Design a protein around this ligand. Structure first.
Ligand SMILES: Nc1ncnc2c1ncn2[C@@H]1O[C@H](COP(=O)(O)OP(=O)(O)OP(=O)(O)O)[C@@H](O)[C@H]1O
Ligand SMILES: [Mg+2]
Lengths: 57, 245, 49, 116, 182, 50, 116
């Protein structure tokens, strides 16, 4: 009864490495994409607002 | 203008001449394909006679003979060529495959497919459809090894669906198919060529009405059936190539 | 299992650094383009005068 | 140009290159539209040979120094005869397409082959 | 001493300048343009010419090898790079930077559909960071190895940071049994 | 010149003649307009040599 | 026609329509002899789209009242641009071709298509 847990933990450990590294990489990609998108957006809308206020003045 | 007209005239003339030349290439290869295709008849006739004689005095029970009691899924294999300029041949293959898929969709079964050839592989790559495995590079000239390995793969896939209940793979450990189909083209005549799709996964027996076995009859039977399947698969290829040319 | 929870701090730290740097760059280029367009507006105002 | 006062080596050099170029012009539009896949084995090998010859004929000139930074080169006659015989008999069909463009000499060809 | 040919077919294709590089030529050569331009760019017209010739020749080819596919990709990147919209004045330093990044194959990773925008992005970042390199050009009219290394490091860091936004009639087969039907 | 294609393709040096030919609805006036507007930055500095 | 005077969507849609029509005109020479069998699907899709759009450019003006005996129609520009964007998207490709002859608006398009 001390050997089935052996294969169970071996199988869990063999895949947990890949699962965790994939999760970390996906989270990094999502956060960097969100940051770049928000910064680029902010830039475009700020340029549009400046264009509009310059037109008004 | 003048230069454009002269260039187009020379272009079209040479195009015409070499289209005739490639037509001659096809005509020349037609004779070789026709000579090669009819060389496997005696082996198939002998093996079919052997199977008839053996199954006459044997028990009728086998996984490839018995049917799955439930309609889970159905496999299919599609063949094609390895060169273009074939006209509507590949279009005919795609229409027949799509119509067979439509007929099978009436039962709601999710089917699986296998492909042979670059053209069909690319066409299905462009579309949103899954592919298990592809074979390419021998449609111009096949052998027995590829047919044998394809038959082995199909047989193992069919056997791996013994106890696939629901989504459970059971003791098989992998989801297995329950039905197989083959779509190809037949050489009716020099100008008559049509696509034929047929089902040959589960054997069926018909009694038309009306020796000694050194080894075990069932051993001979289950050693025999895979050879028959492989021979059918091999016989399909040369027919397909001849119709293509 | 002990090693599993090491890189998450790095991920959070780099996410924070990326966020602050991109906000800084957006602020800087926004103010610069606004100032340049305002200067062009002043130039054209002088031109129309 | 005649075998009367010049060796016939030059003569069949010229005949080989000229017939190669003529049939290449014949098959040009076919390889352009129909596709290289339909040509025969002899025609495919000949078309490759004609491409090799066409690429090898170009050569830099020192008067192009103000236009291109690569300095020009000069080659004698006998070595060119030997190199063309080697090309037209069909031993240099393994070189890449770019390896035959803007070549000083045979040793320059070897150096550029070793550069790729 | 030199002329440029323009055609409507290229205009409708999508090339806004719509200049045909196959025929256009200048006899004065590169002696007029700056030395840094000559060092950075050379025989580009040739490379585009073999690219166009190869595209016309192998439009219907059945099989392509690695060299031909690589040349096709490179020429596609270059031909899409050179396009410029109307009312877009530019300085010489930005032009030489764009040509330098295009020619060295650093942009081969990005798919075609985003090759343009990415360029317009990077020109902005260099404006605020490491701007003095531009300054150097203005007083050197040439590139230095240290400045080139700084530029390549900066573009590598940016491309590491940057992300890509794209990417019945049925027959049966049976067996005959002589045994009478049960 | 403002357009990168011309300078990268066929450089223009002072004292040299260049020809522009094309059909209608091509945009050949745009190149001249671009050059003329580009000259302003050069004329910003007061040196007669520029 | 200029983006400074006209909306960006109009400019983009017009440019895309011109590009598609120009590509079809370019391939018209080759398709004239062989047809569609040799042509790849990646161009068959644009061929179908181009045929559908060039058939959609037809219209039934009032001026034909004395020739075909049918009333004409008028369309606001916003409806026109939105319908053309939808058509360029490829949503309508499943509909039959002959449904696009002499039609006024997209609602009449749908009614005629469903009527057959
Ligand atoms: N880079 C560009 N991108 C997009 N549109 C452009 C570009 N350059 C020019 N155009 C447009 O193309 C058209 C060209 O107009 P232009 O008056 O220059 O024509 P032309 O062919 O030189 O003929 P002409 O002077 O005889 O009338 C205009 O509509 C202009 O806005
Ligand atoms: Mg004009």
């Amino acid at each position: 009864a001390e050997r089935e847990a052996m294969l169970a933990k071996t199988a869990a450990d063999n895949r947990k490495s890949a699962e965790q590294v994939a999760a970390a990489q996906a989270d990094y990609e999502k956060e960097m994409a969100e940051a770049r998108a928000q910064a680029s957006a902010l830039r475009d809308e700020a340029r549009a607002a400046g264009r509009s206020v310059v037109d008004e003045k | 203008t003048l230069r454009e007209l002269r260039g187009r005239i020379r272009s079209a003339g040479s195009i015409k001449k070499i289209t005739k030349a490639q037509e001659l290439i096809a005509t020349s290869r037609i004779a070789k394909a026709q000579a090669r295709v009819e060389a496997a008849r005696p082996y198939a006739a002998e093996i079919t006679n052997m199977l008839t004689e053996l199954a006459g005095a044997s028990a009728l029970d086998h996984p490839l003979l018995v049917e799955r009691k439930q309609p889970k899924r159905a496999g299919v294999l599609v063949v094609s060529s390895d060169r273009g300029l074939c006209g509507a041949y590949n279009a005919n293959v795609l229409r027949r495959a799509e119509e067979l898929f439509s007929l099978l969709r009436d039962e709601g079964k999710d089917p699986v497919l296998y492909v042979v050839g670059r053209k069909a592989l690319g066409y299905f790559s462009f579309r949103q459809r899954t592919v298990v495995e592809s074979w390419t590079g021998f449609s111009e000239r096949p052998t027995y090894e590829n047919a044998r390995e394809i038959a082995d793969t199909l047989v193992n896939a069919f056997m791996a669906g013994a106890d696939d209940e629901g989504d459970d793979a059971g003791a098989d450990g992998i989801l297995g198919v329950d039905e197989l189909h083959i779509v190809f083209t037949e050489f009716r005549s020099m100008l008559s060529q049509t696509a034929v799709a047929r089902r040959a996964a589960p054997m069926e027996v018909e009694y038309v009405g009306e020796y000694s076995f050194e080894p075990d009859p069932e051993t001979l039977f289950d050693a025999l059936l895979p050879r028959y399947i492989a021979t059918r698969v091999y016989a399909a290829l040369l027919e397909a190539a001849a119709s293509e040319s | 299992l002990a090693d599993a929870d090491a890189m998450h701090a790095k991920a959070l730290a780099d996410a924070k650094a990326e966020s602050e740097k991109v906000t800084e760059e957006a602020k800087q280029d926004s103010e610069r383009i606004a100032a340049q367009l305002s200067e062009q507006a002043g130039s054209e105002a002088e031109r129309i005068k | 140009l005649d075998p009367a006062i010049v060796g016939d080596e030059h003569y069949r050099v010229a005949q080989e290159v000229i017939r190669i170029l003529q049939r290449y012009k014949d098959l040009q539009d076919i390889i352009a539209i129909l596709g290289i896949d339909e040509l025969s084995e002899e025609d495919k090998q000949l078309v490759n040979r004609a491409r090799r010859i066409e690429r090898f004929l170009s050569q830099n000139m020192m008067a192009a120094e103000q236009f291109t930074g690569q300095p020009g080169s000069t080659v004698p006659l006998k070595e060119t005869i030997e190199a063309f015989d080697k090309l037209t008999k069909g031993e240099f069909d393994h070189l890449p397409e770019q390896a035959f463009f803007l070549i000083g000499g045979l040793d320059d060809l070897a150096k550029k082959a070793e550069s790729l | 001493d030199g002329q440029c040919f323009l055609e409507s077919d290229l205009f409708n294709q999508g090339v806004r300048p719509a200049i045909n590089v196959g025929v256009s030529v200048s006899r004065v050569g590169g002696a007029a343009q700056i030395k840094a331009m000559k060092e950075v760019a050379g025989s580009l017209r040739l490379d585009l010419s073999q690219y166009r010739e190869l595209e016309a020749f192998a439009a219907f080819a059945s099989d392509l090898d690695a060299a031909s596919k690589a040349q096709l990709d490179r020429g596609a990147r270059l031909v899409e790079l050179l396009k410029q919209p109307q009312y877009s004045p530019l300085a010489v330093e930005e032009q030489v930077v764009a040509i330098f990044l295009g020619t060295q194959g650093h942009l081969d990773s990005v798919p075609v559909e985003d090759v343009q925008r990415f360029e317009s992005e990077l020109l902005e970042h260099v404006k605020a960071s490491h701007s003095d390199i531009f300054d150097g050009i203005r007083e050197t009219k040439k590139l230095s190895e240290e400045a080139e290394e700084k530029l390549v490091s900066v573009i590598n860091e940016f491309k590491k940071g940057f992300q890509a936004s794209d990417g019945e009639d049925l027959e049966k087969e049976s067996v005959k049994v002589r045994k009478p039907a049960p | 010149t403002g357009i990168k294609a011309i300078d990268a393709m066929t450089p223009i040096g002072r004292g040299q003649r260049q020809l522009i030919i094309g059909d209608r609805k091509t945009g050949k006036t745009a190149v001249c307009v671009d050059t003329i507007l580009n000259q302003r930055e050069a004329w910003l500095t007061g040196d007669p040599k520029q």
